[PDB]
Amino acid sequence: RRILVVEDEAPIREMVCFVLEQNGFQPVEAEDYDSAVNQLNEPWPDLILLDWMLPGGSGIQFIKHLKRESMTRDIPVVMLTARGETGADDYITKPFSPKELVARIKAVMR
Ligand SMILES: [Mg+2]
């Protein structure tokens, strides 16, 4: 079960990848906007966890890029936001607990 993790702060991205990994998913990492776009190919993300801001582009822009093609327009998008309208299907605040993330990712998968 493949989850694209778009997140520029490496320890957070690595934290998120470990939770998913230990929980039975196949996580894919992207450190910035460009790298995320180049992760939009076979094999395809079943859900995207999307950080709100990245080097080279925002989460709002990436969601627009997703909604522009039929292959990506349907992929679930959970926006990762920090504390302190958008097209995402759901949102989760940083820091979040590992059980919150999994439970959330599953409620969204459907
Ligand atoms: Mg960021």
UniProtKB/Swiss-Prot annotation:
One of its GO terms (molecular function) is bacterial-type RNA polymerase holo enzyme binding. Its main location: cytoplasm. It is found in: Cytoplasm. One of its GO terms (biological process) is phosphate ion transport. Keywords: Activator, Cytoplasm, DNA-binding, Phosphate transport, Phosphoprotein, Transcription, Transcription regulation, Transport, Two-component regulatory system. The modification 4-aspartylphosphate is found at D51. Phosphorylated by PhoR or CreC. GO terms for cellular component: cytosol; protein-DNA complex. This protein is a positive regulator for the phosphate regulon. Transcription of this operon is positively regulated by PhoB and PhoR when phosphate is limited. This is Phosphate regulon transcriptional regulatory protein PhoB. The chain holds residues 3 to 121 of 229 of the full protein.
